[PDB]
């Protein structure tokens, strides 16, 4: 159900990509094919 109400990827406003990247990991709130990753902001 979490997707339109107020998901995590939305609150923190993250990106959607696979595990084949340096981007951090958050949750699967992202659409199929990609995952909610954490960008390099504020030294993360």
Swiss-Prot record:
Keywords from the UniProt entry: Antibiotic, Antimicrobial, Defensin, Disulfide bond, Secreted, Signal
Task: Name the domain of life.
Answer: Eukaryota
**GO BP terms, alphabetized:** defense response to bacterium
CC per GO annotation: extracellular region
Places the protein is found: Secreted
Tissue-by-tissue expression: Highly expressed in intestine, liver and spleen and expressed at lower levels in brain, kidney, lung, testis and venom gland.
Please tell me where this protein is predominantly located.
secreted
What pairs make up the disulfide bonds? 9-36, 16-30, 23-37
Please explain the role this protein plays, according to its UniProt record.
Potent antimicrobial peptide that displays activity against S.aureus and P.aeruginosa. Does not inhibit growth of E.coli.
Please give the record's comment on domains: The 4 N-terminal Arg residues do not affect the overall fold, but are important for the antimicrobial potency.
Protein name in the entry: Venom-like beta-defensin
């Amino acid at each position: 159900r979490r997707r339109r109400r107020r998901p995590p990827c939305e609150d923190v406003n993250g990106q959607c990509q696979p595990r084949g990247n340096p981007c951090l990991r958050l949750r699967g709130a992202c659409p199929r094919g990609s995952r909610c990753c954490m960008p390099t902001v504020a030294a993360h």
